Structures are given as structure tokens and as C-alpha cells.
Amino acid sequence: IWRKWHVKINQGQKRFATASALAASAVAPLLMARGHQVSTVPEVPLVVDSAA
């Protein structure tokens, strides 16, 4: 039971990777290459008014 189950990651490299993922979420060709169906969404990034 004393094998290594958890991994330590530098916090700077964590923050780099999450920012790189947010940028890729605003590229419509990448959304389709990950299997999403977005042929009828008006704009990307998609923003809705505070009606929720």
C-alpha cells in the first residue's frame, strides 16, 4: 500500500495548462474535432444574458 498513488505538479504549470485550454475552447474547428455538434449555435464564445 506504500506505492505512489498521487503526483505533485508545479502550480505554475497547472495554471499554464488551464489557460491554454480556455483559449482552445474559442476555436470552432477544434470543437468539431472533439465530437461536439455545433452547427446551429450563433456565435463562439456563446454568451447568454443573465436570464438564468
Partner 1 sequence: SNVSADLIWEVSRNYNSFLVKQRTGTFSRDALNLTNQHSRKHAGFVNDKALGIVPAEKGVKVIAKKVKAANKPASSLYTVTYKSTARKAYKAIASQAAKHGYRADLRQAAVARASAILRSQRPVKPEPPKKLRGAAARRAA
Partner RNA sequence: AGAGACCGAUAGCGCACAAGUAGAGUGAUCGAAAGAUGAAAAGCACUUUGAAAAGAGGGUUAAAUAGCACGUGAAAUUGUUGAAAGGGAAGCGCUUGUGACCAGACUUGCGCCCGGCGGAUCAUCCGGUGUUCUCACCGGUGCACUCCGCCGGGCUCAGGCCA
Partner RNA sequence: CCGGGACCGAGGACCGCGCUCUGCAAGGAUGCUGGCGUAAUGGUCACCAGCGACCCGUCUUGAAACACGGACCAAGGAGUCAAGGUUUUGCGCGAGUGUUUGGGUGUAAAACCCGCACGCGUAAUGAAAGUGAACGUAGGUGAGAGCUUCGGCGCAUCAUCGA
Partner RNA sequence: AGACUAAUCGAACCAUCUAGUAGCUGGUUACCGCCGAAGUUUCCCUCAGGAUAGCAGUGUCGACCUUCAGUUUUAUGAGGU
Partner RNA sequence: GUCCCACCCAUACCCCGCCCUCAGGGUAGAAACGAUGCCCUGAGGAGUAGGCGGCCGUGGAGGUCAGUGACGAAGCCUAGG
Cell of residue 4, nine digits: 505512489
In the complex with RNA, which residue's Cβ is closer, 8 or 43?
Answer: 8
Q: Does 42 bind RNA (CB under 7 A)?
A: no
Contact 24, 30 (CB under 8 A): yes
For residue 17, give Cα distances in angstroms to 3, 4, 7, 11, 27: 27, 23, 16, 10, 16
**Which of RNA, partner 1, none does residue 8 bind (CB under 5 to 8 Å by kind)?**
RNA
Candidate residues 37, 47, 51, 52; the one interacting with RNA per rule CB under 7 A: 37
Would you tell me which residues interact with partner 1 (CB under 8 A)? 23, 26-30, 32-35, 38-44
